[PDB]
Design a protein around this ligand. Sequence first.
Ligand SMILES: *[C@@H]1O[C@H](CO[C@@H]2O[C@@H](C)[C@@H](O)[C@@H](O)[C@@H]2O)[C@@H](O)[C@H](O)[C@H]1NC(C)=O
Ligand SMILES: *[C@@H]1O[C@H](CO)[C@@H](O)[C@H](O)[C@H]1NC(C)=O
Ligand SMILES: *[C@@H]1O[C@H](CO)[C@@H](O)[C@H](O)[C@H]1NC(C)=O
Ligand SMILES: C[N+](C)(C)CCO
Ligand SMILES: C[N+](C)(C)CCO
Ligand SMILES: C[N+](C)(C)CCO
Ligand SMILES: C[N+](C)(C)CCO
Lengths: 534, 538
Amino acid sequence: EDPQLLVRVRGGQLRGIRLKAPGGPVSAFLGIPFAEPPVGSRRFMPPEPKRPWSGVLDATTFQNVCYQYVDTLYPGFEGTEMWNPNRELSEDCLYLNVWTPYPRPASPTPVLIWIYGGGFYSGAASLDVYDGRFLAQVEGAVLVSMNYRVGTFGFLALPGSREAPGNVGLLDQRLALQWVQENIAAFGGDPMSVTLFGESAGAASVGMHILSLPSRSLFHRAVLQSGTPNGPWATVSAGEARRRATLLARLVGCPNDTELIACLRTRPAQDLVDHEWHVLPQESIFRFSFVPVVDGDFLSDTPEALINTGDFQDLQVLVGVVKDEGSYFLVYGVPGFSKDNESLISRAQFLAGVRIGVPQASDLAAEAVVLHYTDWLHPEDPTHLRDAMSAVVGDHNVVCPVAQLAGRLAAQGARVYAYIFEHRASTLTWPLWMGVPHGYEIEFIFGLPLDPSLNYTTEERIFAQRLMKYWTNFARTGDPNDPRDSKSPQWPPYTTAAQQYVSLNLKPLEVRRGLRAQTCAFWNRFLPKLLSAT
Amino acid sequence: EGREDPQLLVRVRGGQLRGIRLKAPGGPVSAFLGIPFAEPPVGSRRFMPPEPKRPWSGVLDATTFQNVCYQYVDTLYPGFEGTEMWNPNRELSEDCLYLNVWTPYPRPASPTPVLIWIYGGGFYSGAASLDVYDGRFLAQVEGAVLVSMNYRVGTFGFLALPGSREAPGNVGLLDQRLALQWVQENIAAFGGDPMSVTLFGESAGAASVGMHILSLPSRSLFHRAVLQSGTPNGPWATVSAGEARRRATLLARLVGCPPNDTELIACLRTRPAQDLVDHEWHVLPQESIFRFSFVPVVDGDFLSDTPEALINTGDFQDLQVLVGVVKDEGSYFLVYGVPGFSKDNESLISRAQFLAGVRIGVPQASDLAAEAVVLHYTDWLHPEDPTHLRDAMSAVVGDHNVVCPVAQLAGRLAAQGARVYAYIFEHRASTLTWPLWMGVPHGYEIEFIFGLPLDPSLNYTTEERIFAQRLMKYWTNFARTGDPNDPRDSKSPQWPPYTTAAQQYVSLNLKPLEVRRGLRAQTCAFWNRFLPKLLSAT
Ligand SMILES: *[C@@H]1O[C@H](CO[C@@H]2O[C@@H](C)[C@@H](O)[C@@H](O)[C@@H]2O)[C@@H](O)[C@H](O)[C@H]1NC(C)=O
Ligand SMILES: *[C@@H]1O[C@H](CO)[C@@H](O)[C@H](O)[C@H]1NC(C)=O
Ligand SMILES: *[C@@H]1O[C@H](CO)[C@@H](O)[C@H](O)[C@H]1NC(C)=O
Ligand SMILES: C[N+](C)(C)CCO
Ligand SMILES: C[N+](C)(C)CCO
Ligand SMILES: C[N+](C)(C)CCO
Ligand SMILES: C[N+](C)(C)CCO
């Protein structure tokens, strides 16, 4: 028995495991229950706190992955399967993971809490890319990650109902956050210094905690990587949530809210997943059936309204995007696009693609999109058209929503830093045309290139170390710059006047101005004017 | 005769003429100025198609410019050459249908290609007698035969009650056409070749040239065309029959001829010319710039359909066309209507003034269309920078009215069989009196093409002299062959034709030709493809 691996939390005693990081050992406490299993009658319901336990709870292995759809696009392909569940699926999945330095820190240490993405329909804290041992060992950080319910189980909502109120997957995250407040000191973490970070739906989740009052007392700083609470995919109205839940119920043979939800609770988990993609209103990409709902409770208003009127004075935020946000999604439903060729497309394929990539757009709005993104010097060039299609999907869904949030957060008193991540992993298995896709910064921030067995370059390992420092410096201070270090160049705050952000690549930081400023004016200013008028 | 210069006596269909020997820097030229080509369109003839000049007895003196057609005279900037170089330089009269011919001296012995100039001035102003349209340099240096005609402007040339007998519309274009017919019949008398006739014009003159291209009866009267900063398509060069009728009827009311068309037109004919000019600007539907009250009308006769329809469906197989724009097409127009703009300061404007400016500069835009314009031309890194806003306002007016219509025209003509050459003119005259912020404004290429810098008394630089000579060669090579390039020379860089595929045009400045691609390709897609679609849906 190693006393560094024994911790008493409020629920009782835990035993962790000593894991090996390249530079030395870390302590890992994996699969710690933070809620009562949301099973049987508790399906679709808010999470309840985990009842205390007797003896020593074995916290040496990852727990089950929340029940979810498993990708089948490219069977056997690492680029897709690296995001697939790596443990058994179960509705009994409300567990979290803590990595700390070995030995346990002597003084209270800044805490980073990771919230995974996956379109609110997928993901797990147990994926290899979310491995916290490197940040723990190298930067001395306490890293936490939780599982939260996804798909119907996390976000199926009959708004106004007692039994399926919506947003329960977000309440799972919140409960994990409350757990950190109550318990992280036992591991040597500082509950007065908690930084949330997440990517994609995880970043939208971070944003929603920023916009929901009861969450704000549970953290101090936030990082949103390639995702925002505002924008076209991260939320639905109560009406649209009801529509989708009612339709799924119909599809599984479930005929008053209470009756409807009681019958949904009788169905095997896979029966629900079998139909979750049949409820979207359009043929589309970058759209997910069961996501956070504007309920007037967790979200008191739309994210748009809340970011416009919010006060964010005592908040620091780091936000950014990858170089090619849209490319990943094109292979999931835009004809002409494949990982197996260069995906050089015709103009016809581009116009059709725009309707799928911007599915809520009217005919006129779609025409505006096509005319904006066409290079009128090379209107039928397939390379241009392929890269424009990617651009449309990335800008609409990530870059411009990020630019919008960044600007409103800064105008309303927040301290904001922004980045574009432009380094394409040497080990990437997707084709070159996809560039730096959605999600492929994460492995560097977590510091996987520091593991020699994974075959990243020396340059990539130095780069990872740099990024780990920006992120942990941000966690410690609310400022990603290295404070003992002179010689930078310094990463300046993002402001509405100057609009400064930095490139994160193998070269030293370069400061740029305006995140797609002209094109984002189109998405964020013009298209809405077109909508309210048509 | 007996005692005079035998080299200045010429007979035309109407009778005998005596010209004048003029001095150009390199030698003498022959000038025949103020040759009448129509019966004076006065009295009962006001608003009516021109009638050919009846023959005269004896020798008509053709040694001085004749009357300028009755028109509005600019008084925005008294004493200022920038404005006054465009003002009438001879008596204003309705008796104004006279043309001018310059030729080498002695006259050419073999048939020489003819250039015919059509002046601009928004269809409300202009004269062939202005110093910047002086044909002597082209005549002397290039051996050109050059012809220019006065044509009626304003109400006199373009007031229309469409469908009526007495004010059918487009009579100023019919004046131009009568002059073209005159050249066909008579220009061989001066050594000119009626089988080689190139039209050229600027602004409204360029629009006019384009309308001769789109009207079949004109097509037999010329072979090639140059359109400088003007097009028959676009937002200002024509009006519908309905809008023409509305403006004519309002004008009539304003001058005490309240409304049957015969009666209305008969009362208009009793009015003093100056009365008509005094109310001319009161009939425009919006507060605007780059809009003119009385312009060509889509009458279903001269113009069988809209210029837009006609350029989309036309066969332009046997046409060569040279077209282009100056660097700063919009700036000139800003000081005549947009609050905040002036020749006497830097015209740094606020964002409020930009938004107001856009409504005046795109006067037919809905609220949604105008916010589309504002959002496109705003620099979102520097949305309130006065220098950017000033320059963006200029760009809006220039692109809307000239640059994008020219791109549209060049594309349609090229797609439908024409040989097209395109330019951007980027040299600012060292003698320009407009301020620096205005750049290279609308109209300030003309003095180079005509060769005024060859006159040492005009104080242009030596480099400007050489530049002028180049331009004269391009224009006259195009007149001769339908190709501005020199057959003898080579690299000396070549001017490739404009094509829809490659979109090539050249920079005209003091440096050797540089080839560029796409005339404001992205922005003109906004004007030429998106806004119309907005319009159709909205
Ligand atoms: C530039 O000028 C515009 C027009 O006003 C004229 O010039 C100014 C300086 C006055 O002295 C006035 O007498 C003239 O009529 C102004 O509208 C504009 O505000 C001026 N721009 C600036 C920034 O000074
Ligand atoms: C790969 O691209 C080709 C053409 O480049 C396209 O037709 C095809 O659908 C793509 N995917 C397949 C079917 O392998
Ligand atoms: C040109 O230059 C001379 C000598 O400086 C000057 O006196 C004359 O008035 C100028 N003329 C013009 C056309 O500006
Ligand atoms: C098609 N799915 C929605 C299942 C995958 C999203 O990328
Ligand atoms: C958001 N994920 C990283 C889970 C998928 C995109 O690569
Ligand atoms: C059109 N102008 C500006 C030249 C005169 C208006 O009064
Ligand atoms: C258009 N004009 C040339 C006639 C006036 C100055 O631009």
